[PDB]
Each structure stands twice: as C-alpha cells, then as structure tokens.
Amino acid sequence: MATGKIVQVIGAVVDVEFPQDAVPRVYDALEVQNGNERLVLEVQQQLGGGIVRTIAMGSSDGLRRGLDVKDLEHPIEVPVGKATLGRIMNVLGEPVDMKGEIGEEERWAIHRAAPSYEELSNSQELLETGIKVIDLMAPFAKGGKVGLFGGAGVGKTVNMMELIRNIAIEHSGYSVFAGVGERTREGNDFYHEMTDSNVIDKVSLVYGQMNEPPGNRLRVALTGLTMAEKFRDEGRDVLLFVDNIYRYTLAGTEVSALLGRMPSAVGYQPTLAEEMGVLQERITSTKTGSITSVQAVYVPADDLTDPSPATTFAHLDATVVLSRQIASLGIYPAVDPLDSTSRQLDPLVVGQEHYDTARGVQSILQRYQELKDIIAILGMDELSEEDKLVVARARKIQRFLSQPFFVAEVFTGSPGKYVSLKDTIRGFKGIMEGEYDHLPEQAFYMVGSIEEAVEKAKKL
Amino acid sequence: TGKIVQVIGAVVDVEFPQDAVPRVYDALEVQNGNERLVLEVQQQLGGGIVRTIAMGSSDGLRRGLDVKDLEHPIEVPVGKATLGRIMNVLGEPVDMKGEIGEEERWAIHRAAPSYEELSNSQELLETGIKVIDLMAPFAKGGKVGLFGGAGVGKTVNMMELIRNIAIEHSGYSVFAGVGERTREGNDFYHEMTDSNVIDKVSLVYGQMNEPPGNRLRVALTGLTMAEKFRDEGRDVLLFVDNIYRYTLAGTEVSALLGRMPSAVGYQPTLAEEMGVLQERITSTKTGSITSVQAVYVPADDLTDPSPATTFAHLDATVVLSRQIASLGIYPAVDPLDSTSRQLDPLVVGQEHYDTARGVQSILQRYQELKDIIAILGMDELSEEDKLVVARARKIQRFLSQPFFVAEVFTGSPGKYVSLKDTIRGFKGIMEGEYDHLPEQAFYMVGSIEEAVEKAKKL
Amino acid sequence: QLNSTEISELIKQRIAQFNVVSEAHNEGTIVSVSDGVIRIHGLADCMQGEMISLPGNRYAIALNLERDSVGAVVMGPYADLAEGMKVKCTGRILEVPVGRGLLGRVVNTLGAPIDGKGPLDHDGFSAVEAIAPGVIERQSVDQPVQTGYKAVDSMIPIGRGQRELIIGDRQTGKTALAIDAIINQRDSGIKCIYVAIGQKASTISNVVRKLEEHGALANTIVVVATASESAALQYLAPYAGCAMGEYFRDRGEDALIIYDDLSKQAVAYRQISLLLRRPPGREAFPGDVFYLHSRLLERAARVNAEYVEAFTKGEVKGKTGSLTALPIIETQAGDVSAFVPTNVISITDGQIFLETNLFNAGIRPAVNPGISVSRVGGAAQTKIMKKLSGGIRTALAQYRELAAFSQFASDLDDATRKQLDHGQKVTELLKQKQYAPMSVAQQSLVLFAAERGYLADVELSKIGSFEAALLAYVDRDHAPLMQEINQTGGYNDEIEGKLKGILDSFKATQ
Amino acid sequence: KVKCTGRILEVPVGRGLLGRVVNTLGAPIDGKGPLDHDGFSAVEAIAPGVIERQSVDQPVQTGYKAVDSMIPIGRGQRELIIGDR
Amino acid sequence: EFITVARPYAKAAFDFAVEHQSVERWQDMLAFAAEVTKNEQMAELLSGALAPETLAESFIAVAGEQLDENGQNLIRVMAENGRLNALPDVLEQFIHLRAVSEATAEVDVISAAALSEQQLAKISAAMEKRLSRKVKLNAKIDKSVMAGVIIRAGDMVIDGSVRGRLERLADVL
Ligand SMILES: Nc1ncnc2c1ncn2[C@@H]1O[C@H](COP(=O)(O)OP(=O)(O)OP(=O)(O)O)[C@@H](O)[C@H]1O
Ligand SMILES: Nc1ncnc2c1ncn2[C@@H]1O[C@H](COP(=O)(O)OP(=O)(O)O)[C@@H](O)[C@H]1O
Ligand SMILES: Nc1ncnc2c1ncn2[C@@H]1O[C@H](COP(=O)(O)OP(=O)(O)O)[C@@H](O)[C@H]1O
C-alpha cells in the first residue's frame, strides 16, 4: 500500500509528503512508478509536517507531482555472499550483467555502524601479497588501506588483477571491486581482461560510472563495502578495490550542493571528513576476519594539501606510486621504490632485518639516482672506483624488483611467480652485501627467488 | 518588567511593554539560577523586543525568565579609589580584597573629545631599546602599536616598555588585558606587587576564558579609567595587551545580531566599532594619555581587514615578523615596515634622521639582492654589493638586544641603550669603521663598545 | 514568504486551546531531522546547554532557544529518530561522570564505558562547560613535568600547570611523544588523561594496549571519539576530558591531559556550525573558532592553596593542584602561518614544533629549534638541568640558519670547525628511541659532558654505544648518586666535582 | 514621531569658509566662531554637461620635480593618487 | 502572494472543522475575517509594528461573531506568526479542501449567449461522467466567443468556440 505523494521535483531532489505519523526514517528507501520503470528514492532529510526530502537513484525525468510513493520500511538492501561472485551489479543490487539473475540467499542493508571498539582484533599482522616490490618497500597491513597514485599505461590494472589472483589462490579470500565514477569503457575492458584470465570467478563487481545520477555514484561504494562485509563475517580475508575514491568525495559534494548546504573549506561539503570516515572506518581487521582495501587516489591540481587528499591520507596505511619511467625501463610492476611508502616499515612492526634491508635498498637507489646524472654529463669514466661499484649493484637491485605475474603470461610467457617475504629479504640482502656480484645483471631480470637468478645465470 | 523570549548563545532577546522599552545601551538584570547576570541591550526591534548581549555565561537561561530594567548604562568605579586593585568588566572587584571605595562612577560609553580640545606634542620619549627609538621613535602623549603574529614578541616587548618608562614615570598607569592569558595577568600582578609599584597601576581584565561580552566591553571600561585620570589634569600611561580581541569579540556576536557579513567575515561596522574606541584614547589640553597597544594580526596576514583598518589610528607602528624571530634576532622588529610620525628631521634632528634612513636604505638594498643570492650564490655579486650585504647582516645583528624581562628565556643580562649610543653605533657601522669584526660580535649586545669586546672572545 | 516550522496539526492543537502551556513544560516533540541537527517543538522549560533525553538511550544538547522551538544536536547515531517522537528535558546542564574510579578505563565522550569491564565507579558528575579559575586564583608554574625525551626536557621544558602545543605535519611522531610523556608519569604521582578526537579506532586500540604493556594504563583515563562518530561527540570530547582532569586539579592533585587532535575538533565544530547555517570566516571556519579552543585550554591551570581550600570546603588544607595540557595540532605542508595553527599558538604557553625534513633525515624526535619555545622557560626546570642547558636552543637557531646560508664551504674557519662540530654532535646526541625514557640524572650528566666541551673535538659518531655504556657504568658501579641527583635536582660544586670524577673514570675505559 | 522636511542636505558656502575647519554639515569645529558664509548650496548636484565644459590647458603646479615634469596636472583634471599605506 | 503560507492554516482549520461537525460555520467565520482584512484602516493597523498579542486583540474586537475555538485561537496563532494578511487565501484553500472531500467540482462554462437548460443539464450530466464528482456549473456571457462554449474544469479546458477554431485555422496556414 502506497501512502506518500510527490510534492516537488527539482533536478535529482524529490520531496514527498506522508501522513504525520508514517514519516519514513532518514536512510529509508521509497519507490515510485516513473511510467513503467520503478524508481528508488533514498531519503536524506525529514522536514516539518511530514515532508521528506530524498534523492533519486535514477533518472528524475518524467515524474509528476502527486504520484503515489511506496515506503519500504528498510534502507537499500543488496544481495551478498557467494552468489555474487563473477557477477556485475549496480548500486541497487540489480544485475546490469545479462547472465540472468542472482540466486542470493540473503540481503543486507548498505548502511551500518563500523566495528565496535571491543570487536577489533587485538593484534597487528602483515598481508603477504607475493609481489617483491610491494612486500619489501611497502608491506600491507591485514586490514589497512593502500593508495595507488600512478597514471595510465603504467599497468595499474594488471597490478589489481595480480592482487585479485594471489589473494584467492595463495590465501583463501575473495575480492570486491567497486568502480565509482570512472569510465564505462575501462570497466568493460577490465571485465573482459578478467574473464580472459580466469580471475573473474573470484571477484564480485559493482559499478557506478560517470554516466550515473549523483546518488548512484555516492552509494555504490557502500554497496561494494557491504558485500565485502558479508565475506568478512564468513571468516575470510577480503580485498576491496575502490577504483577512485576522489569521485566518491566529489559525488558527496554534488549531493551536498543539491541539498543546499553551505560550502566548506574549498567548496567541498561541510560533512567531508565525516563522509570519508564513515566509509574508511568499516575497512578494519576484526576477530572474525578482515577487509584490506586498495584505493586508487587522484590528487586535484597535484596538490597534496587540498582537503580531499588531505582527508584521504589520514586513513591510508600504505602508498604505492607507479611511474612511467620504470615502465620505459621495461621493469614490471612499475612501482617507484623511492616514493612508495608504508607506515609498517617500522622496525618493531616488521622487524629490524626487513627494515634495514629496505633502507639499504633505498639508499643504494637514491645514490644511483645522482650517479646517473653525473654520468649523463661527464661520462662513465669520471666516476671513482667506488661509485662504479654502487652503480653495478644498483643496476642489479633495480632489476631484481621486476617479477613475472600469473596474469601477465599473455605478454611475457613466463609461468609467473609467487615470492615469499623471507625469500625476497634473503635475495636483496644477498645482492646488497656484494654476494651474487659474480653474475650479470640480466640474470636477475624477470625472475622469482634468487636461487632462480643464479640458475638463470647458469643457463645464460 | 520584561521576559526572555530567545537565547542564541551570547545574545538574548527580551520583551517589554511598549511604553517601557529600554534605551539602546541600558543594562538589564536576570536571576540566572542563583547568580545575577547583566545584559547590555544592543538593538531595539519592533513590537517592544530588545536584543542584548550577556555580560556573563549564558548557560542555564530559560526563556520566560523575568528581567529587571536598570535604567542606566553599565557604570564602573573610577578615580583614586581604583588604583592598586583588579576589577571586572562590570567594575566589580575581582581580587579577594573588599569593596572599592570610589566616590564616583562613570558610564563606559562616552563621546570622544572635541577637535578644539586636542593637543599635539613633539616631546620625544626615550626607551632603552635600540631599534624602536632609532626606527620608530614615539613622543609623550602619542600612540604606539606593536603588530605581530603569534609567538613573535609583542608581550615581551610591551613588558620591556613598561619596565623602561612606566617605573621611572611619575603619573598613574592603567593596564587593560583584553582577551589574553590569565597566567600572564597573574604574573604581572605579582611582579607589580613584589616591586611595590602596584600602588600606581590600575588593572582591568577580560581574559580569554570569558564569554564574548566581557571581552567586548572590557577595553571600554579600562579606557574610562584612563579618561578619568586624564580629566583630573594628570598624564597617564595606558597599556592594552591585545586590542584585536576587542574586534574579534564583536565578530563572534555580529552574526547573531542579524547583520549581513562583510569582507572576510567581519561585521559590517568593523571600522566604526574600532574608531569609536581608538578616537577617545587621546591627549587633550588638560591631560595626556601615552598608550601602548598590542595588535595581533591573524595568520601573519598584514592585509587582513582588522590590522589594515588599525594602522591608521596609530602614531608609531612597530611591526614584528616571524621570519626575523626564527633567526633568534629578538626583538623581532622589521625595520623596513616600522615607522613613526616623529621620524622627521625637524623633530628628531638631522643626524638621527640620516642614520635611520641610511639603515633603511641598505637593508632594502640587501632585500633586493636576496633573490639573486638564492639562485646564483653570493659569488656573482659586484665587489661593492658584497659590502652592502655584509654591512646589512651586521646591522641586522646589531638591531638585536637583550632584555631584562627576557632574562629567564636566555641567561644574558638585560641591557639599556641610550639614543646617543645607538646612533653612534649605527653611524659607525654604516661608514665601515667596524668592517673588520665578524657578524657574531654584534649578536645580542648593548652599545657598540660591547661588540668590540665580544669580538675578542669570538 | 516562508514557513517557520508551524505545521497543520500543531496549529490544530493550538486551535483546540490556545494556552497549550496548560500541558507539561517538561517535554516536546521532534519536528525535523537533518545531518544530526534536530528541531524540537515545546520544551518551554528547556535551558540552553541542557541535556534533552531522546527515545532509546540518547541525549541531545540544546543549542538554541528560539521563539518557538529548540535547536539541538544529537550525541550519537541520529538516523533512528523520526518526526513526532516524544522528548523529555532532564533539568541538568551537560554533565559527565567524574572521579578517581575512572582511572584505567576507556570511556565514551559521555562517560559511558567502552571497554568490556562493566559500569563506572565514578564519584559524581561535573559540568562539561565551565569557566576557568580567575586571575587571582592562579599560581606561578614552577614545578617540572618530566618527559622521557632528552631533547624537550633540555630545550623546551614543561612545568605542572603549563600548556604545550605539539604541532607538526602528519607522521612526525606527535602521538609518539605524547603517549611517551604519559608513560613517563607511570611512577610520579601525576595522573594522566588521553582524549582521542577523530582518530581511527585501530590506532586507539593499539595505543591502549601499548599503554597497558608498559603499566601506564592503570594510571590514565582514555576518552575516545573515533572518526566514525557524530560530529557533536568529536566536538565535545575534549571538554569531557578537561572536566575529568579538572577534578584532580580542584582536589589539589596533578593531572596531565593530552588532546590528540584539536585540528579535528575544529573541523567537527565547523561542520556543526555550517549545518546551522552560520556565516563562516577565514578558511570557512566560524567566527568564534578561537573561543572554541581558548575556553578549553584556559582550563589547564595551576591554582593556589587558598582556592583548593575554598573549593574542598577546607578538607584539603594547603596543597596546590594543577592540570597540564598538551594539545596536538597537524599542519598542512609544514607551514604555521595558517588560521587554526596560529590560533592555538596564540593560546598555549610553549610550542614544540616537529619538522618533517628532520624527521626524514633520521633526526628523531624532530624538535626544530628556533621555532619551538617554552614561554614558562627555566622556571619549570630542576636547577641542575636549568644551569647545564642555558641557552642552547637559541644557539641552534643560528647554527641552523648559518649552516643553511654558508653552503659553499666552511670559509672563515675561525672556530666554525669547532662550532659546527659541537652543534652537530649535540644534534646527534639529542637523537633518541621511543619508549626509552631517560631520568633527569642520565640527561643531566649527558648534557654536562656535551655543553662545555669534553666532546667538541672527538667527532667519534659512535655516540649511541658510548652513551649506552656510560649509563650502564654509572648504574652498575660508579654512582649511587644516580638516586640522589634524581631525588633533589641540586647543582653544587661538591657534586660537580663528583660528576667530573665519574666522567673521566668512565672516559678512561672506552 | 518623525516629520519630513521637504529639503535636501544643504551646506553653507562662500568665501568666509576659506581658512576654517568645518565638519561635513558646515558647522565650525575650530572654535573660532560662526561662519561668514554666502548662502547655502545643495550637497547632491548635477555636474556641468558636455557643451558647458572647456579643454584643460592650464597648469596647476605641485612643486615636485617628479610630478610636474612627467605627470602634469591641469586645472580641471582629475588625478588619482594611489598607493599602499 | 502567500498561497504557501496559507496552506497549513487552511488545512488545520478544515481538519478541525470535521472533528466538530461545523465546516459550514467555519467557512463563513473565515469569510468574515477575510473581509475585515481588506478594510483601509485595518490594513493600516496590520502593517504597523504592534506587538502580536495586542495586535491580535485589536483584531478580535472588530469580530465578536466568532467561536472561542475559531477566532480567539486561529487569529492569535496567525498573529504570533504575523500571517493575518493571509486570511483571504486561507479562505479559498479551505473552500477548495472542502470541495475535495465532498467530491465536488466547480466547473465553469463560458458562452456567447444563454444555453437552453437542456444543453446545460446535458453538460452537467456529461461532465459528471468525464469527472467523478458532482459538478456545479456557473455560466458566463462573453461575447468574444461569438458561438459555442468553453468548459473549464480546473486546469483542464475544452474549447469549442468559433474564435478558437478560427485562430487555430489561422495557424494551420
Ligand atoms: N624517536 C623515534 N625514533 C624512531 N622512530 C620513531 C620515533 N618517534 C616516532 N617514530 C615512528 O614514527 C612513526 C609515526 O609516528 P606517529 O604515528 O607517532 O606520528 P603521528 O604524529 O601520530 O602521525 P599521525 O598521527 O598523523 O598518523 C611511528 O610508527 C613510530 O614508530
Ligand atoms: N606484469 C607485467 N608484465 C608484463 N607486461 C606488463 C605487466 N604489467 C603491465 N605490463 C604492460 O604494460 C601495459 C600497460 O597497459 P594497461 O595495463 O592497459 O595500463 P592501464 O591498465 O594503467 O591503463 C600492459 O598492456 C602490458 O603491455
Ligand atoms: N628578547 C627576547 N628574548 C628571548 N625570547 C624572546 C624575546 N622576545 C620575545 N621572545 C619570545 O617570545 C615568545 C612568545 O611570547 P610573547 O612575545 O609574549 O608572544 P606574543 O607576541 O604572542 O604575545 C616567548 O616565549 C619568548 O621566547
């Protein structure tokens, strides 16, 4: 039985009037017959006299005043669980994929409180991703946040696919990919590249792209997160990918402007630092499971002080920078090891040996960065006999960082490798302290453990 | 007689019969719980409604309370009776001593003296500070203002001026602490009481814990005591520890009074609210007020509307800067921005004027060279430009001075420098007779004869 | 022409009988709900600042008593509320539970426990909003508050009753220095309080279990308002922490309170102020943002014994209480010429500025001299520390600027080869490891054998092992005065002689 | 109660104003007694039209080498003096 | 114009009048108040800055033919809000609300000359089938129509006038 009446329509904002006692609550979902298609409205404010101001999860065109509105007694609810693996859905949990229907057993509301204080895991742990550069220079905390800062062409998608693969095969978790406010072309070719790599069976996709009304681009991230939470409750370790969190911030700004709230520090909404925390606070390790998150980040005008980057960096635990220079060198993954950062490189968190190994590698590479500039203007033979050795070890460290991925075989043919942390610690200790000096630099390129480097040097 | 009908933070709306509505600065009284709260009416709306600012904490006020119409403005004790004592914004005693023995009480809202009643004086006043009375000398009965951001030295300087003039001075003195730390008010009070000079200094405090109304009206209630001492024919010293907090306390209240905001948030009436106060603190033909005002500048922005509109009301403006303070060069005065009405050859003599202008000229020339030194290094400079650079750095060091009040931040003894010695030293540096000493010989010394000694010990 | 929250059925109730005040003044009804702000109709008895009780177990704070309705903010999840809910006014101004039974608990901003250990053993309730002691009730701060850090106890001394800003960029050791200053009070009679505003819950749980490991948790109260929680809780949390510390202050005891981020209390208050449609000022902050922090930090004070007598009705005769505050501020890109950082620099006494460049270069804690100051100064220090460390911060203020200007070469080598090796080794020996607090004796001997030579020629750059051997030699054999120079703080020639003797006695064996 | 005069702000004017200090309403404030004005003039008025003007071809001398040589001012000219404090 | 401010007051007055079975009396009470609102002297008083309470009493006095429930409460509530000038609209909304619950429509007809009362009764019975209400026709004699009739039923209109067809033809060309 419908009970409300549409009273206003201004852009994507719809006001509906209910009996004085039946007023919906704040985040409840209403629905309307916009012609033949049904339309879902998410309430945003309760005004006086039974009026309720909501935002349309769809196209607002065609709505009359006085249309009948039906009050669903619950927030937006989406399917969760195994049934959603390999599918594609929109904010409302509807298959935009055309493989039919989702046979979910259960549905969850996208809005809920973060884990309680006594519910968090009283421990701190690393996530072995299996990638040498990330595991060494920027380890992942199980339940932390990670930023991806590279541009395009640098292979970001292959990095995400390798993570999706390794978290499923080597660990025993699943993954959710929430694409908020990004090109539809990239989501289509990402789905196709994932089905051409047999990882689609292990990831659940949710999309709100640039062509979507503001509310979809706002709530898609909460849909992805609430699926990741159902995977967490089952006792698993989950990976959640957010394809651009800056667009989540920007869609919150658009919705705030539509509701008519005063502009904050740089025009952003006044609720910026709370809208961000309400998302990022649900991504935590718990004593039943954990959700780790990888978030592609975009910095407006290359300004690390702008309120959006400034608010995002408060939550990230690690930061991986992708550089085109490293890719032009033919090194993949193209992770820049000097700027890549993690706050788990704390000798009491990860240990003294790992910490000092990473610091040594970094010092060697940032010395090579200047010896390269000296060479570029004075020639090789100006360097002293000591610098000529640090260059020789730098050019080998710089190549032992490359790796073959199980998903990159279509490019390099190599079977792809998963490298344990202690083994890469061993390998870089070796290369760094002069051991393995007696083999050429090409013996380290695109190889797994250092024993495979010595055996390749044998074959070479 | 009337009843509260609204409470928005610091502002309160009161309804009266239309035949009894109060006037536009009268005081009103409310029984807030068990305490007694005073409201000052700011506006007469229609219908008999009146908008007021609470001279106290606003919490606990119900709407519908009865309020009592005092038919006179806020009035404070004044005169001899108020000398060795601390007072509230309402003129109530705030030290634990008994009541004040005043015979007369004055309303804190008063008109400025007439134009034919003013007086102007060239009589230079000496301070033991090199930079201040070289670059920005000020005269008996004039206005001085210390501009700076946060942490740059405004209070350590005002206290040095107090020590160097206010003790070896005959007449009375008044200190108004408008929205500053209570710790510093207690320290000042105990310093005065332990120097047996408290019998000449009258204190008022509206420190930064107080609600907006106290910080708003405390400066006026202090100016009223200064004015009473002036009208008795005396000559008075008036120290205002932060006048910016007088305008700020207005801004906080401005929006609640229903006034559309102006340029950077300030109230529309910023320049009138400031001029109505600054213009009654002046010397007259019956008496003179020599005043020192600290003037906080927010975010170090000297172009913010409040400093910009305050610059016009002062005779001597001493501008402190954070860049100089970060070099350890206290007092951190910027000599390329401090100025004075009295820095004219017909007032200070030709030698002083020429010395000050030469100092300015070569510090400005060094400013013009800094940007090329940053890029190319100091080796590209002409042979005579290296000399102006070195002499400019030596002047910048010699402008520093140790203070008797800073004797607890560093250990150095305080130094008092006479005007003759400072011009004798700067004229010596400028013409190169001290070119052979290192820069460190000039850091934190008194006269130049102490720099020549410090050079021997490196 | 706009409506003013007068609606059909409320007008109908007034139609039934105009004087509805014949009904209870004790209660009203919610009329609208938006982003945590609530409008209530009725509540003729409400007073500003009052706690209004909502269905469930929740409270709102009455901010506005307008002509016909009360504007309030909800202290908790607000989405559960709806129009027409009956609401009752408790006749209490906002008050938090307080007492010494809170020590070792983790509590919500409303004093509701958040650990699993059950209810509170609080003494009573005290108002969250108060006016600090007057100017005549204060007393001069002249007692030392000891942090474990050789750098700050020397350059930036702190004193019971003082207020030290800890300001710096993100990830520069602010919380490290704060919780280490808390840990160092484990056995010095001075209570601790840590209030975390806007911090993500993993961090707070980690620091709580870290405090528990080192045995400090039994001595501290933890107040938490995490990043997920309503803006009203984040904005009112530090006032609850201050109200909890002010109890010990007013009983003539000592407390040290740490506000983990005032730069996020400011943001929560800006959110609340902009949702209430107030005109913003510089950087979009409200006009009264200064008055937000001042009336808070002005409550950290040291009070004379007459005030403690007048407060406790005579019961604690002749002891002086104090509350020491250390607020933390985060500044973007290292600039301090910003609105809120400069607002707080204009309120606290001292200023410990932690620099990102030093922090990356390995100099930790990255206490930047020349910018950092202590406005209380040597009055806070034990006279030994005061005399040994006379003017070195201003020495480094110029050492830094000169090493920055004279980049091409060490020219004019009069003594710069000694000056800029002394000033290098001093920096190198101020370096320290966290969770390793050095008592005043260990700091004092180390400072004496750096500050008047004895190590300006020997640039050995093996300083960590040298000092770890020195402090071990003096503990095992060479000194029982390590429990005398740390009991008094005295600076005699008779003890200077013993210090020189032990100095050379150790020296002759390295 | 308020009564509306049909008048518009007028101010004293004349040669007797010459050498006096006067407030914006024409009242003396120097204390040297009343004004020897020559009637009153309207504060708000209309400037002379296009055809009533004449070309500026007469100098008004500042006595400053920097201005009179390179930024001349003529009788009837409007010259802004603009700068910082 | 204050339709939007009058909606709540009209809805409250009507929703109260049906709890007390006196819609018909309330309508004329509001009509009296709507007329007093128009006087040239009363319109001068309503503009002045009197206190809402005494301004409400200065309005009760000129209308004693009012219930305790109706005048002495509604006028006071509207005075507290300063809404009294809205009374002429609070009336119309009230009428409209009534016509909704009573399932009635005030269809208007326009013609060049009187209709035969067979035409008009057919119009009534036909509109009552087009709509789902008891219609209440009122005619207007407008000469510019010349022939035929305009039937206006709120925002719906059916135009059969020869002028409308003529100027439609003029735009077919
Ligand atoms: N003296 C020190 N020596 C070595 N490492 C240190 C020292 N102090 C702090 N650290 C390390 O620096 C890291 C960051 O410090 P911390 O988290 O306290 O900074 P913060 O001010 O809390 O930053 P934010 O609160 O913005 O995250 C910590 O992991 C800690 O291990
Ligand atoms: N691990 C890898 N091994 C080999 N080649 C790689 C690897 N990662 C990336 N590449 C190369 O880099 C290219 C980057 O293209 P693409 O992944 O589409 O960039 P982006 O995904 O950022 O748009 C890949 O098509 C592939 O040729
Ligand atoms: N001559 C000086 N010697 C040493 N420190 C000084 C001197 N002048 C100012 N300062 C410094 O100024 C700091 C800030 O205090 P103050 O000058 O009162 O600040 P504000 O200008 O904000 O009132 C003091 O802690 C002190 O170190």
Ligand SMILES: [Mg+2]
């Ligand atoms: Mg000060």
Ligand SMILES: [Mg+2]
């Ligand atoms: Mg921290």
